[PDB]
Design a protein around this ligand. Structure first.
Ligand SMILES: Cc1nc2c3cc(-c4ccc(NS(C)(=O)=O)cc4C)c(Cl)cc3[nH]c(=O)n2n1
Ligand SMILES: [Ca+2]
Length: 109
């Protein structure tokens, strides 16, 4: 079919997203949301970081990887069937018309 990420109800879901910081400690803000990246900034926002730290999160949504090294992969805890969908991870590279947009398809059964 096409790239997808899978989980059963009650498991954690794992959606990958990565960037390479220009130099260590120099982080780029990231936008995670539910819905494809053409929607608003990154869909219906679930989690955000800035140059310093996580600045916004929704219950059950986590960055448990080394986000200070560019691993901004998402964990969704205790998934239900309502969690299926496209998710947008947007790397907000400083500057205009240069963001990286990743659309991740999650299928729960
Ligand atoms: C009570 C609760 N807390 C969180 C939470 C917290 C975080 C978070 C916030 C700052 C940092 N930065 S730090 C201090 O340098 O490690 C690191 C993380 C992982 C995230 Cl991403 C997601 C979260 N999701 C969530 O459902 N809950 N619930
Ligand atoms: Ca940009």
């Amino acid at each position: 079919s096409e790239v997808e990420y899978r989980a059963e109800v009650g498991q954690n879901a794992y959606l990958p997203c990565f960037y390479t910081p220009a130099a260590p400690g120099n982080l780029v803000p990231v936008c995670w949301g539910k819905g494809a990246c053409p929607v608003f900034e990154c869909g219906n926002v679930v989690l955000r970081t800035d140059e310093r730290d996580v600045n916004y999160w929704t219950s059950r949504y986590w960055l448990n990887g080394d986000f200070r090294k560019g691993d901004v992969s998402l964990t969704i805890e205790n998934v239900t069937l309502a969690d299926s969908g496209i998710y947008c991870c947007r790397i907000q590279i400083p500057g205009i018309m240069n963001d990286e947009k990743f659309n991740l398809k999650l299928v729960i059964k």
